[PDB]
Design a binder for this molecule. Structure first.
Ligand SMILES: NC(=O)c1ccc[n+]([C@@H]2O[C@H](COP(=O)([O-])OP(=O)(O)OC[C@H]3O[C@@H](n4cnc5c(N)ncnc54)[C@H](O)[C@@H]3O)[C@@H](O)[C@H]2O)c1
Ligand SMILES: NC(=O)c1ccc[n+]([C@@H]2O[C@H](COP(=O)([O-])OP(=O)(O)OC[C@H]3O[C@@H](n4cnc5c(N)ncnc54)[C@H](O)[C@@H]3O)[C@@H](O)[C@H]2O)c1
Ligand SMILES: NC(=O)c1ccc[n+]([C@@H]2O[C@H](COP(=O)([O-])OP(=O)(O)OC[C@H]3O[C@@H](n4cnc5c(N)ncnc54)[C@H](O)[C@@H]3O)[C@@H](O)[C@H]2O)c1
Lengths: 363, 357, 360
């Protein structure tokens, strides 16, 4: 064995509760957390009564959770504009830090927290846990062996027909900075680049729509109940067009509300010189799908996942994301999600937003 | 009317936790348990939620327990004969698991030991009590297939080696997937045909993917150490019976076929045909009759039952009631002995020759 | 320009009018016929449709062979004559294309190879389903070892109820067997060909005479009724063929059996690295081919994609490949030695009317 890892958690809510806390508990052999911050201390204490170890810290404001020099790693499950604050310099006053999903809504703040990190000495990672799904790994591994050839056309799918989240921070334009483009669209673009392993941006064009978000009959049909139409501060959909310096191109579609039929998110579509591939996931897909396509021995074929069943008496990615995170600081290696990659992601989404000036942004 | 049978389970591992204990609890009105496993914490943990019952690590100490009236042996296959025979049939009714034993002659000793006892004996062939298997069984007993001359036994998994115990230890199991899941399919097949007159047996045993480095990739039950794969990964047989009927058999834990169909049978008759579908490629067990009717080819299948707002339990209940009321359990030991005889003859084609009966 | 090969047809029967005549007119630039059929009005009518000017129409094959103007002979008589019309004769000046099974007899077959080697001429057998695009796809992938070593295979030649009620197939005199040599030939040829294993060590089979003479057997037959009182041949058979490298091949063949899946001219292969199966027959409106393997710790399957929109066969592919190999002096795809192993094994399965495994 080897001691343990003393974890500090900042912000206890939606994805501290649905992803982060269960992830750590199912790897308790490597972690146990005292932490339990939040501006609202009511929740902070409750978590530390379920997942906090034998007598622990429970601060009401982070600045002194970071004081305790026995905590060694921090999980920033803030909202988005606090993502910079609680992380940049603040947390790396002597810690490794796991910041959540959209690294930051701003590119400058993101560039600040990568330099605060590069002097940290410690380690850093972002919550793109979808990389750890078995089929995304499968596709990533395939593109690493060049079995798709060289990818010259990619698509990032992050579409929802009417699945606007009405339960938390995602609609406060000030707390998260943007709408579905940086909510879910950041997941799909991360995989697309990661498999293509192309991060050298040249140009960016985009369009941001504000159409169903303010229509009276807008919330009609939304999965998560109605929402106040006269208070929609973000967008309902956005579409992107990014050209790389090797010539490759990526199209992006992101939305919470749009009258399209195929709700496909956390997915991508790659087109190489030897083969292609597409991943399927979202509201219209009860099971995640992976389909290669190529010409083999002069016939067009397609290779997909086979249906896995159970036996008489015998028979995930959030846990795999987190476990790999701890063993990373433990054995002293690199986590899978690299900080510079999440940086490339946010600066393009930002660039797609900044095409709110109706002009293509060259990099 | 009748007081609960007092049960002692030897072996508190996999099949004991997910088949026997829930079934015994479902039929709690006919039984109560008074626990054994050489990893004693397994026995203690089971004695905590299913049991002031005995909790030992020596099986010999449990058959000494005079309060035990029925013993269930759910330890690996090699162990089956020692625990069951000259030991358990010391005034104890015995329910022995799935693979009677690995050897035709430890099995022949077990039967002999059972008949001396004057007690009750049966084997864990719970797949018989699936309603569609019962369905097929009733239809050939009625002869609605005619004479059955071709029967297929399906016991194939594409990639599902059991990795939670000792299934890959020839010293403790005696064999691989041939006697692990091929016994279920052969049991059903011969039981429906009511034929046990073996003429000849030709078989093959494959060692290909168990030790392959890439073998464990895609396994339902996590990876397996290729170094310590001491038994086969597939085997097929060809059995001829004296009435002219022929039985094909396919068994495997790992093989690159597409159709994972296990605990299933296919029967071609002179008047009609039928086939059972079950396994990892089937989210629902299926039963399909086929025949010509009014000069047109037809097929009869189970209709989709839904809602409005299992077989182990059925098997366990009829077992305890056979003991209580002094009747016959459904799976006769003679039937399970013919099966392992045929399975050992399939193996015994390590001599590259058709064993003849 | 290469001078057209002068073809002589022996047996102007059903296979000539469905396979050989339209193929030879589809490659009419490489050939021209110059027709023998004991039922002389068949040859005379065949010559009026596909013949070339003064064509030789006679009823004795030994006369056609004495035509100096013929150099390639297709033998499309029944199996009982597949040999003598091909051995001694035919291999007495000419190249010969003998039809589907080489012979019902094993030794009849081993002697037409000897007459072909002592000939210096070309020789191929009408196993034309090797030329279906999906069958070569599989053939190409195993040649490249992409399945690994194939240690277990299955040959599928099953029909639920499709006893051929026309032609010659029900006449045991002219064929020597039923579905085991009518369609089990095709299935086993493909299976051996992809495994590339023609080294037998054991054959165990069983032959069933059940629905064929049963009164209600003909009920629901796809081609119509047949009289069970005259039925001379089996309705199904199953075999268990072991090879020397250790591999195993099960085989299923039938015109009539009470199973659900009518799969014929198909194969299934399980290799050390991957597997594959082909689907063809009367339960398959379009041929299928499915590779199966593990790719990055996940089970996957690779199948042909649906082609459509049309615009804006294996019979003639087999024939051109055959004609060309003669002009260029190449060798045809179907090797005579391969076809010999096929009806050896099939004979060894039949030859379990001894209820004994016949070792090799
Ligand atoms: N699939 C994913 O990985 C995923 C999903 C949803 C959200 N996220 C990301 O995770 C973060 C938000 O997730 P959420 O849905 O749980 O939001 P949330 O509002 O439900 O949880 C955040 C909590 O932190 C508290 N908070 C606000 N400011 C704080 C501060 N300075 N210090 C301490 N606590 C503060 C709030 O009270 C709130 O309860 C964001 O960075 C978001 O973009 C990721
Ligand atoms: N669908 C079915 O019917 C089904 C399923 C699984 C297993 N089985 C059969 O049931 C048997 C047990 O297999 P399993 O799945 O439970 O794997 P398992 O290894 O988990 O169960 C065996 C347990 O018995 C214990 N054991 C070994 N030797 C012992 C001894 N002398 N005394 C006491 N305990 C001993 C082991 O510690 C183990 O916990 C096997 O013979 C197997 O073939 C049947
Ligand atoms: N898919 C295939 O490759 C396929 C299909 C059917 C038949 N075949 C093969 O082709 C042969 C049978 O052909 P068929 O189905 O057209 O039978 P068929 O009865 O329709 O035609 C055979 C003709 O040969 C003639 N014949 C018989 N003996 C002769 C002799 N000594 N001399 C000259 N002519 C003679 C007969 O007159 C008859 O017209 C067999 O070798 C059979 O196995 C192959």
């Amino acid at each position: 064995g080897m001691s343990k890892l003393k974890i500090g958690i900042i912000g206890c809510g939606g994805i501290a509760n649905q992803k982060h806390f269960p992830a750590l508990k199912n790897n308790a052999d490597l972690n146990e957390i005292v932490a339990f911050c939040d501006i609202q201390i009511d929740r902070a204490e409750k978590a530390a009564a379920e997942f906090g170890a034998e007598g622990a810290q429970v601060t009401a404001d982070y600045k002194e959770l970071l004081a305790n020099p026995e905590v060694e790693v921090v999980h920033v499950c803030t909202p988005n504009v606090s993502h910079s604050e609680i992380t940049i310099a603040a947390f790396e006053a002597g810690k490794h830090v796991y910041c959540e999903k959209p690294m930051s809504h701003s590119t400058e703040e993101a560039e600040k927290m990568v330099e605060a990190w590069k002097k940290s000495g410690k380690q850093f990672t972002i919550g793109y846990q979808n990389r750890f799904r078995e089929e995304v790994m499968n596709l990533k591994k395939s593109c690493d062996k060049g079995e798709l050839g060289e990818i010259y056309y990619g698509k990032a799918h992050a579409v929802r027909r009417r699945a606007v989240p009405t339960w938390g921070v995602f609609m406060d334009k000030e707390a998260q900075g943007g709408g579905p483009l940086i909510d879910i669209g950041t997941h799909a673009l991360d995989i697309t680049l990661w498999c293509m392993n192309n991060y050298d941006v040249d140009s960016v064009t985009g369009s941001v729509f504000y159409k169903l978000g303010q229509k009276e009959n807008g919330p009609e049909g939304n999965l998560f109940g109605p929402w106040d139409p006269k208070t929609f501060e973000v967008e309902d959909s956005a579409v992107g067009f990014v050209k790389m310096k090797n010539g490759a191109t990526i199209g992006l579609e992101a939305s919470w509300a749009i009258n399209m039929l195929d709700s496909r998110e956390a997915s991508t579509t790659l087109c190489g010189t030897e083969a292609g591939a597409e991943i399927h996931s979202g509201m219209s897909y009860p099971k995640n799908e992976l389909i290669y396509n190529r010409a083999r021995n002069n016939q067009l074929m397609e290779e997909t996942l086979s249906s896995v069943g159970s036996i008489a008496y015998f028979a995930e990615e959030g846990t795999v994301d987190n476990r790999q995170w701890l063993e990373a600081i433990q054995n002293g290696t690199e986590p899978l999600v690299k900080p510079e990659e999440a940086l490339a992601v946010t600066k393009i989404l930002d660039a797609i937003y900044k095409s709110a000036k109706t002009n293509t942004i060259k990099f």
